[PDB]
Design a protein around this nucleic acid. Sequence first.
RNA 1: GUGAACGGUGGAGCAACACCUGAAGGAAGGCUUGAUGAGCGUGUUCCCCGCAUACGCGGGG
Length: 174
Amino acid sequence: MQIEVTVRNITPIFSAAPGSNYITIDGTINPPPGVSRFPLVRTRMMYVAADVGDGVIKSVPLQIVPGNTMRSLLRRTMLKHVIEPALVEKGNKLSIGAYATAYSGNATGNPDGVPSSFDEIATMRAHPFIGLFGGGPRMLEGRLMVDSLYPIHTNAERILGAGYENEMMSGPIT
RNA sequence: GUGAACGGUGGAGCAACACCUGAAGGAAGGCUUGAUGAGCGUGUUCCCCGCAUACGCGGGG
Protein backbone atom coordinates (compact mmCIF):
# COMPACT_ATOMS: atom_id res chain seq x y z
CA MET A 1 0.00 0.00 0.00
CA GLN A 2 1.41 3.34 -1.17
CA ILE A 3 1.14 6.63 0.76
CA GLU A 4 2.20 9.89 -0.90
CA VAL A 5 2.52 12.68 1.68
CA THR A 6 2.86 15.98 -0.16
CA VAL A 7 4.09 18.63 2.28
CA ARG A 8 5.21 22.23 1.94
CA ASN A 9 7.94 23.55 4.20
CA ILE A 10 7.03 26.75 6.03
CA THR A 11 10.57 27.49 7.27
CA PRO A 12 13.93 26.51 5.67
CA ILE A 13 15.10 22.88 5.77
CA PHE A 14 18.59 22.05 7.08
CA SER A 15 19.57 18.37 7.04
CA ALA A 16 23.33 18.80 7.38
CA ALA A 17 25.33 16.81 4.84
CA PRO A 18 28.47 15.34 6.48
CA GLY A 19 31.72 16.75 5.16
CA SER A 20 34.09 19.62 5.89
CA ASN A 21 32.92 21.96 3.12
CA TYR A 22 33.87 25.62 2.85
CA ILE A 23 32.45 28.86 1.49
CA THR A 24 33.64 32.36 0.61
CA ILE A 25 31.87 35.59 1.54
CA ASP A 26 30.31 35.93 -1.95
CA GLY A 27 29.34 32.31 -2.51
CA THR A 28 31.83 30.02 -4.33
CA ILE A 29 31.28 26.72 -2.54
CA ASN A 30 34.56 24.85 -1.83
CA PRO A 31 37.10 27.41 -3.08
CA PRO A 32 40.82 26.89 -3.72
CA PRO A 33 42.83 27.43 -0.52
CA GLY A 34 44.00 30.91 0.42
CA VAL A 35 40.76 32.84 -0.22
CA SER A 36 39.83 32.86 3.53
CA ARG A 37 37.54 29.84 3.57
CA PHE A 38 34.64 29.68 6.03
CA PRO A 39 33.12 26.43 7.40
CA LEU A 40 29.91 25.46 5.60
CA VAL A 41 27.54 22.65 6.53
CA ARG A 42 25.61 22.07 3.31
CA THR A 43 22.10 20.67 3.43
CA ARG A 44 21.57 17.07 2.35
CA MET A 45 21.65 16.55 -1.40
CA MET A 46 20.80 13.50 -3.50
CA TYR A 47 22.31 13.14 -6.95
CA VAL A 48 19.47 12.40 -9.36
CA ALA A 49 19.59 11.45 -13.04
CA ALA A 50 17.59 14.11 -14.86
CA ASP A 51 16.86 15.63 -18.27
CA VAL A 52 19.32 18.50 -18.73
CA GLY A 53 18.61 19.00 -22.44
CA ASP A 54 16.82 17.30 -25.30
CA GLY A 55 17.94 13.67 -25.14
CA VAL A 56 20.67 13.99 -22.47
CA ILE A 57 20.41 12.70 -18.89
CA LYS A 58 22.92 13.92 -16.29
CA SER A 59 23.49 13.40 -12.57
CA VAL A 60 22.26 16.71 -11.16
CA PRO A 61 22.12 17.72 -7.48
CA LEU A 62 18.73 17.80 -5.78
CA GLN A 63 18.37 18.91 -2.17
CA ILE A 64 16.50 16.31 -0.11
CA VAL A 65 15.95 15.09 3.43
CA PRO A 66 17.13 11.45 3.77
CA GLY A 67 14.64 8.66 4.32
CA ASN A 68 16.34 7.58 7.54
CA THR A 69 15.56 11.01 9.06
CA MET A 70 11.92 10.66 7.89
CA ARG A 71 11.74 7.03 9.16
CA SER A 72 12.98 8.00 12.64
CA LEU A 73 10.67 11.05 12.61
CA LEU A 74 7.62 8.86 11.90
CA ARG A 75 8.80 6.41 14.58
CA ARG A 76 9.26 9.29 17.02
CA THR A 77 5.83 10.88 16.50
CA MET A 78 4.00 7.55 16.87
CA LEU A 79 6.11 6.78 19.94
CA LYS A 80 5.71 10.27 21.42
CA HIS A 81 1.94 10.58 21.25
CA VAL A 82 0.33 7.31 20.10
CA ILE A 83 2.45 4.54 21.67
CA GLU A 84 3.71 5.90 25.00
CA PRO A 85 0.22 7.25 25.97
CA ALA A 86 -1.14 3.78 25.11
CA LEU A 87 1.40 2.39 27.58
CA VAL A 88 1.16 4.89 30.45
CA GLU A 89 -2.63 5.36 30.46
CA LYS A 90 -2.60 1.57 30.83
CA GLY A 91 0.33 1.62 33.27
CA ASN A 92 2.62 -0.56 31.16
CA LYS A 93 6.34 -0.15 31.89
CA LEU A 94 8.71 -0.68 28.97
CA SER A 95 12.25 -1.69 29.88
CA ILE A 96 15.18 0.62 29.16
CA GLY A 97 16.32 -1.84 26.49
CA ALA A 98 12.72 -1.98 25.28
CA TYR A 99 12.74 1.82 25.04
CA ALA A 100 16.05 1.68 23.17
CA THR A 101 14.75 -0.95 20.74
CA ALA A 102 11.50 0.97 20.23
CA TYR A 103 13.16 4.33 19.57
CA SER A 104 16.20 3.04 17.66
CA GLY A 105 15.52 -0.49 16.37
CA ASN A 106 18.02 -2.15 18.74
CA ALA A 107 18.98 -2.27 22.41
CA THR A 108 22.72 -2.86 21.92
CA GLY A 109 25.06 -2.70 18.93
CA ASN A 110 25.44 -6.50 18.70
CA PRO A 111 22.56 -8.33 16.97
CA ASP A 112 22.17 -12.04 17.66
CA GLY A 113 23.26 -14.34 14.86
CA VAL A 114 20.62 -16.90 15.80
CA PRO A 115 17.21 -16.54 14.09
CA SER A 116 14.04 -16.08 16.10
CA SER A 117 11.13 -18.51 16.01
CA PHE A 118 8.50 -18.06 13.32
CA ASP A 119 5.70 -17.52 15.86
CA GLU A 120 7.70 -14.62 17.31
CA ILE A 121 8.24 -13.17 13.81
CA ALA A 122 4.52 -13.50 12.98
CA THR A 123 3.47 -11.83 16.24
CA MET A 124 5.87 -8.91 15.82
CA ARG A 125 5.01 -8.36 12.16
CA ALA A 126 1.34 -8.54 13.16
CA HIS A 127 2.13 -6.05 15.93
CA PRO A 128 1.12 -2.46 15.01
CA PHE A 129 4.42 -0.79 15.96
CA ILE A 130 6.95 -3.64 15.69
CA GLY A 131 5.59 -4.62 12.28
CA LEU A 132 6.30 -1.12 11.00
CA PHE A 133 9.82 -0.94 12.47
CA GLY A 134 11.65 -4.24 12.72
CA GLY A 135 15.24 -4.82 13.76
CA GLY A 136 15.72 -5.88 17.34
CA PRO A 137 18.41 -8.28 18.55
CA ARG A 138 17.39 -10.91 15.97
CA MET A 139 17.01 -8.50 13.03
CA LEU A 140 13.31 -8.38 12.16
CA GLU A 141 12.28 -6.89 8.83
CA GLY A 142 9.73 -4.10 9.18
CA ARG A 143 6.76 -3.66 6.87
CA LEU A 144 7.40 0.08 6.42
CA MET A 145 9.38 1.52 3.50
CA VAL A 146 10.19 5.22 4.05
CA ASP A 147 11.45 7.18 1.05
CA SER A 148 13.51 10.37 1.21
CA LEU A 149 11.72 13.73 1.00
CA TYR A 150 12.16 14.99 -2.53
CA PRO A 151 11.03 18.48 -3.58
CA ILE A 152 8.66 19.04 -6.47
CA HIS A 153 11.43 20.05 -8.87
CA THR A 154 12.21 19.42 -12.53
CA ASN A 155 15.49 17.82 -11.40
CA ALA A 156 13.25 15.20 -9.74
CA GLU A 157 11.26 14.84 -12.99
CA ARG A 158 12.36 11.22 -13.43
CA ILE A 159 11.57 10.56 -9.75
CA LEU A 160 7.93 11.66 -9.66
CA GLY A 161 6.91 9.68 -12.74
CA ALA A 162 5.20 12.79 -14.24
CA GLY A 163 2.45 12.64 -11.62
CA TYR A 164 2.56 16.42 -11.19
CA GLU A 165 3.08 18.40 -14.40
CA ASN A 166 2.50 21.73 -12.60
CA GLU A 167 4.16 23.59 -9.67
CA MET A 168 7.56 22.45 -10.97
CA MET A 169 10.41 24.46 -9.44
CA SER A 170 13.06 25.21 -12.07
CA GLY A 171 15.79 27.34 -10.49
CA PRO A 172 17.95 26.78 -7.42
CA ILE A 173 16.15 26.06 -4.17
CA THR A 174 18.93 26.86 -1.69
C1' G B 1 81.04 -48.13 -40.69
C1' U B 2 79.10 -44.64 -32.56
C1' G B 3 75.19 -53.28 -30.49
C1' A B 4 74.98 -48.75 -35.04
C1' A B 5 71.42 -48.09 -38.73
C1' C B 6 65.04 -47.50 -38.80
C1' G B 7 60.73 -46.14 -35.39
C1' G B 8 54.71 -39.85 -33.98
C1' U B 9 52.49 -41.19 -27.82
C1' G B 10 48.63 -41.36 -30.35
C1' G B 11 43.39 -40.72 -31.36
C1' A B 12 38.21 -38.89 -28.44
C1' G B 13 35.98 -36.48 -24.05
C1' C B 14 31.31 -29.41 -21.64
C1' A B 15 33.43 -28.11 -14.86
C1' A B 16 28.79 -28.09 -14.75
C1' C B 17 23.81 -27.58 -12.23
C1' A B 18 21.04 -24.39 -8.31
C1' C B 19 21.90 -20.13 -4.77
C1' C B 20 18.37 -12.36 -2.76
C1' U B 21 24.30 -9.51 0.81
C1' G B 22 20.56 -8.89 3.67
C1' A B 23 17.86 -7.22 7.79
C1' A B 24 17.75 -2.32 11.67
C1' G B 25 19.77 2.76 12.22
C1' G B 26 17.69 11.16 12.85
C1' A B 27 23.75 14.76 11.09
C1' A B 28 22.73 16.66 14.92
C1' G B 29 22.44 19.36 19.34
C1' G B 30 23.92 25.15 20.45
C1' C B 31 25.66 30.22 17.51
C1' U B 32 23.00 38.74 16.84
C1' U B 33 26.87 40.20 10.39
C1' G B 34 27.65 43.50 13.96
C1' A B 35 30.60 46.30 14.26
C1' U B 36 35.29 48.54 13.73
C1' G B 37 38.20 52.37 11.51
C1' A B 38 34.88 58.90 9.53
C1' G B 39 34.43 64.88 13.16
C1' C B 40 36.53 66.85 18.19
C1' G B 41 43.20 70.49 22.95
C1' U B 42 48.02 72.60 22.40
C1' G B 43 51.07 78.74 19.34
C1' U B 44 58.02 79.17 19.18
C1' U B 45 63.74 77.63 19.81
C1' C B 46 64.76 73.07 24.11
C1' C B 47 67.47 67.92 24.26
C1' C B 48 70.16 63.89 21.34
C1' C B 49 71.58 60.59 16.47
C1' G B 50 74.35 60.19 11.70
C1' C B 51 76.59 62.45 6.89
C1' A B 52 80.12 65.50 7.15
C1' U B 53 84.03 67.51 9.11
C1' A B 54 81.32 72.27 10.70
C1' C B 55 79.54 76.35 5.18
C1' G B 56 75.15 72.90 6.72
C1' C B 57 72.03 68.99 5.73
C1' G B 58 68.63 64.90 7.08
C1' G B 59 66.28 63.23 11.95
C1' G B 60 64.10 61.07 17.73
C1' G B 61 60.19 63.73 21.56
